């Protein structure tokens, strides 16, 4: 039974990957393993480029630390200016998939006291759908937003005939 390495030990992230893979590949089974590896970037990325690079670095570190898995998944949240979002990276041995989730405007008060490297600042939460869930009256949750990005990041693997190398 092939396994999938998640560049994170957060149960929430591992579950989302589980849900995304079970949704897209319901006819297959894998062992999802959440590993802990450095991103080699700020614990709190302050740019789109840095957020994506951090996800990419974790995936490379994951491959090096736990070789042999069929898929490696990186999931990194970050912010740019007044927006927040997360980068999704899925890598097989030969191909790579990626997608950035929809971005959201954070409150100015939360933003100002976040540049100070403070997250938990969201107290004026990681159980009611996160910042997204709170800000959207739960019409969206971090899980349902990440789910879409994860599925999008799998496109290359879903349509091999259209995405070579």
Could you list the residues that contact a copy of itself (CB under 8 A)? 23-24, 97-105, 107-110, 124, 132, 135-137, 139-140, 144-145, 148-149, 151-152, 154-156, 158-159, 162-164
Q: Which among a copy of itself, Mg ion, none contacts residue 122 (Cβ within 5 to 8 A by kind)?
A: none
CB of 8 to a copy of itself, least distance (A): 19
Contacts of residue 75, Cβ cutoff 8 Å, sequence gap at least 6 = 6, 7, 8, 13, 16, 17, 55, 86, 87, 88, 89, 146, 150
35 or 122: whose CB is closer to a copy of itself? 122
42 or 163: whose CB is closer to a copy of itself? 163
Q: Which among Mg ion, a copy of itself, none contacts residue 128 (Cβ within 5 to 8 A by kind)?
A: none
> 139-143: which pairs have CB atoms within 8 A and are 24 or more residues apart?
142/12, 143/12, 143/15, 143/16, 143/19
Joined tokens for residue 159: 């349509």
CB of 75 to Mg ion, least distance (A): 17
3 or 138: whose CB is closer to Mg ion? 138
User: Distance between CA 121 and CA 87 in Å, rounded?
Assistant: 21
CB–CB of 39/57 below 8 Å?
A: yes
CB of 109 to a copy of itself, least distance (A): 7
Q: How far is CA 39 from CA 3, 36, 48, in A?
A: 22, 10, 14
CB of 91 to a copy of itself, least distance (A): 13
58 or 100: whose CB is closer to a copy of itself? 100
Interacting residue with Mg ion among 8, 51, 61, 84 (CB under 5 A): 61
DSSP 8-state symbol, 35 = -
Exposed (0-12), middle (13-18) or buried (19+): which is 124, by Cβ within 10 Å? exposed
Which residues lie near Mg ion (CB under 5 A)?
A: 61, 138
């Amino acid at each position: 039974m092939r396994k999938i390495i998640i560049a994170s030990q957060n149960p929430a992230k591992v579950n989302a990957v589980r849900s995304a893979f079970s949704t897209v590949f319901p006819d297959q089974e894998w062992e999802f393993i959440g590993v802990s590896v450095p991103s080699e970037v700020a614990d709190q990325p302050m740019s789109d480029e840095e957020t994506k690079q951090g996800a990419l670095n974790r995936v490379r570190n994951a491959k090096q630390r736990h070789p042999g898995a069929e898929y490696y998944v990186g999931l990194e949240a970050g912010i740019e200016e007044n927006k927040t979002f997360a980068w999704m990276i899925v890598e097989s041995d030969q191909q790579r998939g990626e997608s950035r989730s929809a971005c959201l405007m954070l409150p100015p008060l939360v933003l100002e006291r976040l540049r100070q490297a403070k997250g938990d600042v969201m107290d004026e939460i990681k159980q009611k759908g996160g910042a997204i869930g709170l800000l959207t009256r739960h019409h969206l949750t971090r899980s349902t937003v990440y789910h879409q990005a994860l599925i999008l990041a799998l496109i290359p693997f879903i349509n091999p005939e259209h995405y070579p190398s």
